[PDB]
Design a binder for this molecule. Sequence first.
Ligand code: 6GY
Length: 282
Amino acid sequence: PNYCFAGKTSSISDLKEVPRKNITLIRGLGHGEVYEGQVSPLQVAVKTLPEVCSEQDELDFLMEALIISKFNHQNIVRCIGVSLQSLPRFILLELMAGGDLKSFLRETRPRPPSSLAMLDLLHVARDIACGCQYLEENHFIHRDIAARNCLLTCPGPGRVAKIGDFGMACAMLPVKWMPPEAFMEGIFTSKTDTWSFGVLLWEIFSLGYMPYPSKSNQEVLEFVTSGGRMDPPKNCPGPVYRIMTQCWQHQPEDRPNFAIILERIEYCTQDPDVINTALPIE
Ligand SMILES: COc1cc(N2CCC(N3CCN(C)CC3)CC2)ccc1Nc1ncc(Cl)c(Nc2ccccc2P(C)(C)=O)n1
């Protein structure tokens, strides 16, 4: 299997094979399965392929390794290497100690008080938008920009958010992150990623709520097609909500590219009225 990105073609032979003897598993992290690990010492996350799997599962795994290995950006998770010549097969990734963003948001929600502030949220949004701008500039369509696919380097301040999973690149389709022309026509473009980014913003500023809270997939599809959009998250500043509503323009041509999203995020970050807004206490 071959893979091309940024005008270069790569195959399995170009991946960095790490000797199996140099890899130590430490603990499970979530769902294949992902472990904390060590490479002789580098801390890694280890994505494993079940030994019992289809040929297409094997190929899917290979492709995910080539895709992640060829990216070179600070807001995309690094691939340390692979161990594909012993079973089970491993992909070695940068350990993101802060976890997935969805869990982080849910678990770090202000409770009775200042576990998070608005600037933390804007920094995460900026980081992911920089990641997406890098993809868009390199003509890569992610297809599943969502909080569950983003990771944080560390729990505390100085955390950096990064795009972590590239699995997507009917009942399993992430309808709630997809614009009309994607779920209706199966047309994907970089404006597809813009729409999803809008939904991720909502996830961020809601502190990890499921989009379109009470609606099923079909309800969302009919709602969104008819021009329905989500309400602002609780205490969401107007300038932030305006970015969401621009990302959710019906016409792909009317949605901003990531360079523009980034500028608008940076303007929000500069506005004292935005960053002095208190997050809701649950
Ligand atoms: C310590 O590092 C982690 C911790 C957790 N946590 C988050 C809280 C969770 N909580 C604690 C509190 N408890 C009561 C309920 C559970 C426990 C696990 C999750 C993930 C990583 N790291 C990590 N790096 C790289 C990758 Cl690449 C990855 N990948 C990854 C790991 C897990 C899920 C999804 C992915 P993705 C996006 C789809 O690749 N994952």
